[PDB]
Amino acid sequence: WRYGGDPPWPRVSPACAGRFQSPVDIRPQLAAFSPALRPLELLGFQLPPLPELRLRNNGHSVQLTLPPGLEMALGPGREYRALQLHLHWGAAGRPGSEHTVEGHRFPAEIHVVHLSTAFARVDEALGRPGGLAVLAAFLEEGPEENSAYEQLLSRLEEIAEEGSETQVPGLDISALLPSDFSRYFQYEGSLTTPPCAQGVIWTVFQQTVMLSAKQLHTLSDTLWGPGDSRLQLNFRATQPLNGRVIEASFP
Amino acid sequence: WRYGGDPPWPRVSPACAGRFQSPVDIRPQLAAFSPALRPLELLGFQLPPLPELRLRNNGHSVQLTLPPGLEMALGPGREYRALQLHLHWGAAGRPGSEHTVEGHRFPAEIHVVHLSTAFARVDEALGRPGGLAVLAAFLEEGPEENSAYEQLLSRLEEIAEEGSETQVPGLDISALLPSDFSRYFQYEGSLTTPPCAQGVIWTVFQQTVMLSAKQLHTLSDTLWGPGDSRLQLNFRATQPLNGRVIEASFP
Numbered sequence: 001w002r003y004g005g006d007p008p009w010p011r012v013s014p015a016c017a018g019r020f021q022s023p024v025d026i027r028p029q030l031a032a033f034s035p036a037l038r039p040l041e042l043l044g045f046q047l048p049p050l051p052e053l054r055l056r057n058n059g060h061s062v063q064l065t066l067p068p069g070l071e072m073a074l075g076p077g078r079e080y081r082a083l084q085l086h087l088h089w090g091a092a093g094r095p096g097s098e099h100t101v102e103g104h105r106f107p108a109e110i111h112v113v114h115l116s117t118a119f120a121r122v123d124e125a126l127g128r129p130g131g132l133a134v135l136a137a138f139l140e141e142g143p144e145e146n147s148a149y150e151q152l153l154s155r156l157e158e159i160a161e162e163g164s165e166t167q168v169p170g171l172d173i174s175a176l177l178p179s180d181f182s183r184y185f186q187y188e189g190s191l192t193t194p195p196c197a198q199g200v201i202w203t204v205f206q207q208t209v210m211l212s213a214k215q216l217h218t219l220s221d222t223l224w225g226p227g228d229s230r231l232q233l234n235f236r237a238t239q240p241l242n243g244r245v246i247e248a249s250f251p
Numbered sequence: 252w253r254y255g256g257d258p259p260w261p262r263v264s265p266a267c268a269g270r271f272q273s274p275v276d277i278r279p280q281l282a283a284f285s286p287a288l289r290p291l292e293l294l295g296f297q298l299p300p301l302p303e304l305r306l307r308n309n310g311h312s313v314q315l316t317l318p319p320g321l322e323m324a325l326g327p328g329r330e331y332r333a334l335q336l337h338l339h340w341g342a343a344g345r346p347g348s349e350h351t352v353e354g355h356r357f358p359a360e361i362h363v364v365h366l367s368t369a370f371a372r373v374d375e376a377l378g379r380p381g382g383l384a385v386l387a388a389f390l391e392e393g394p395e396e397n398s399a400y401e402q403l404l405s406r407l408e409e410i411a412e413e414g415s416e417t418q419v420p421g422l423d424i425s426a427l428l429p430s431d432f433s434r435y436f437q438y439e440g441s442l443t444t445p446p447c448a449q450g451v452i453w454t455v456f457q458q459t460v461m462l463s464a465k466q467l468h469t470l471s472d473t474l475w476g477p478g479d480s481r482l483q484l485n486f487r488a489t490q491p492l493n494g495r496v497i498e499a500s501f502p
């Protein structure tokens with residue numbers, strides 16, 4: 001599989017043809033206020049610098065493999081373990097977030113993928129309701145260099161080639177996310193790459209995180225993918241809600 | 252195990268001392284309204300008189316085994332298959348519902364236990380979030396004789412003995428349930444018996460079903476359990492929410 005071209009996503013995995021896929025267009029006016037959605041709780045995201053983490057250009061994204069001990073809770077009794085995070089981005093004057101708001105596509109998006117504590121392995125979780133949970137935040141231009149993002153983006157040159165990887169010091173993973181964990185949209189959907197398995201709980205933050213123009217250019221302009229193509233516009237087309245109701249932690 | 256004897260419930264299974272158990276006291280004023288909670292969908296519940304169904308006195312309750320084909324959805328793509336129903340009941344003018352509403356205990360409660368379509372086996376679903384779902388309704392005293400319930404209560408004489416079972420004709424299982432499938436409370440808890448597994452979605456109908464005084468006497472006064480003991484007060488004590496918010500399908 002490779003974005004833009006073919007192989008035919010259903011010909012890879014039949015789940016990429018499901019009715020309840022991600023990403024989606026968030027229309028806040030059609031979102032349902034649910035005061036049961038409490039603030040997200042993160043535990044153990046402030047890493048020491050050793051051991052180092054593996055940052056990889058997998059030719060579809062850049063991903064940071066997270067170590068054991070990062071606990072995330074969607075609520076009381078809704079407990080997850082972080083596995084990894086990766087980015088989606090566009091290109092020179094072209095946004096590349098996966099999710100949209102009222103049709104607005106943002107420059108870029110971070111996904112932090114988690115595994116329900118009820119499951120020891122991803123393959124037991126796939127397609128199971130609540131088995132996987134993803135935290136999604138939009139990346140936008142601000143005036144300052146984001147120092148948490150700088151620790152990853154200053155290493156993209158080392159992993160320009162598809163299939164390249166490098167070691168990076170542990171950092172505050174929570175610092176790649178918005179400070180507001182209270183205000184978010186939540187819906188059920190799928191992985192956004194094969195096998196696009198359903199039952200995924202998506203949490204999209206209202207607050208965005210700020211990168212400098214230079215940071216955003218480094219992300220869009222440094223990596224190569226399948227063949228001699230620039231790794232760019234690495235986002236799936238928006239999928240219809242198909243009668244699903246996005247919830248919001250706020251009216 | 253027996254209903255709070257010796258038998259130690261945390262001693263049989265220490266899961267009985269988990270943080271997120273059932274049953275709970277429902278406080279409607281404290282329930283979170285989410286317009287995302289759609290009407291319950293129950294298809295295939297109108298069973299023909301044949302094949303006949305196992306009705307059994309397992310010593311702790313009366314259970315009806317349900318055939319394949321009873322399909323239930325809590326939402327879009329949150330689908331379930333009914334396995335069995337059973338009841339909880341009191342004694343001579345003593346209420347025996349498991350759930351309470353603002354401290355009110357109702358005469359009796361019906362549980363219809365379902366298996367997520369994402370799990371082949373009950374034992375894979377136990378302890379996994381949403382693996383099992385139970386539909387719960389309160390049985391109250393009303394002036395009329397209840398036709399759906401008579402089909403089951405009339406056959407209890409035949410299974411007074413612990414371990415005893417009979418066959419009974421197919422009946423409309425959906426006839427045992429209240430009027431409005433759009434009005435319910437919903438939370439995540441546990442089995443109310445050992446092994447007290449967590450990850451159970453409980454859906455508790457707002458409105459009740461009415462049986463005659465005779466019918467509720469038929470139910471409490473006919474069955475025997477462990478020893479020379481009447482099968483009665485087969486309900487667990489109310490458990491704390493520990494931060495869990497009960498949701499409601501109506502404002």
Ligand SMILES: NS(=O)(=O)c1cc(-c2ccccc2)cc(-c2ccccc2)c1
Pocket residue numbers: 058060061062063083084086111113122132134190191192193
């Ligand atoms: N976009 S996503 O959130 O649904 C997602 C993307 C990618 C992905 C990552 C890099 C490049 C290409 C795609 C990997 C996963 C994933 C699912 C389960 C376990 C681990 C990772 C999840």
Ligand SMILES: NS(=O)(=O)c1cc(-c2ccccc2)cc(-c2ccccc2)c1
Pocket residue numbers: 309311312334335337362364373383385441442443444
């Ligand atoms: N009260 S309950 O809903 O939590 C409940 C669920 C199941 C149950 C049934 C099938 C599959 C899986 C779980 C069985 C019982 C039960 C009642 C009397 C004696 C023994 C067991 C009770």
Ligand SMILES: [Zn+2]
Pocket residue numbers: 086087088111192
């Ligand atoms: Zn992603």
Ligand SMILES: [Zn+2]
Pocket residue numbers: 337338339362443
């Ligand atoms: Zn029960």
